[PDB]
């Protein structure tokens, strides 16, 4: 149909802004501290801790599936890369700090990404 299109057409659109989105949190990121999977070989009782992991390059993949049919479901991955590590790491570590400073950098993206998705619809 016609209205499946559009509908098609805006998620494509939608997947634009996000892409644009996930860049520049990517560079909130300098140290690449949450651009990959933690790692099961090097961290085994990882699971144990974190029931759903998340990183930057399964967003990626996601995204480039069209897999996000918001900008809610978006956030909610962005928000597990941070939480998941301001819990395994104490607050004394890189690890933690730098998601402090991902979340708080993220945060003005975010707002104005919000924005963008009311305001083009």
Do not use: W
């Not at 897999?67 to 790491?89: A, S, V």
């Amino acid at each position: 149909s016609m209205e499946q299109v559009a509908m098609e057409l805006r998620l494509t659109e939608l997947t634009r802004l996000l892409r644009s989105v996930l860049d520049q949190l990517q560079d909130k990121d300098p140290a690449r501290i949450f651009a990959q999977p933690v790692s099961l070989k090097e961290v085994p009782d990882y699971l144990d801790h974190i029931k759903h992991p998340m990183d930057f390059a399964t967003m990626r993949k996601r995204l480039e599936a069209q897999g996000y049919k918001n900008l809610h479901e978006f956030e909610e991955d962005f928000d597990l890369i941070i939480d998941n590590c301001m819990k395994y790491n104490a607050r004394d570590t890189v690890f933690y700090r730098a998601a402090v400073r991902l979340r708080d950098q993220g945060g003005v993206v975010l707002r104005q990404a919000r924005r963008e998705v009311d305001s083009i619809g």
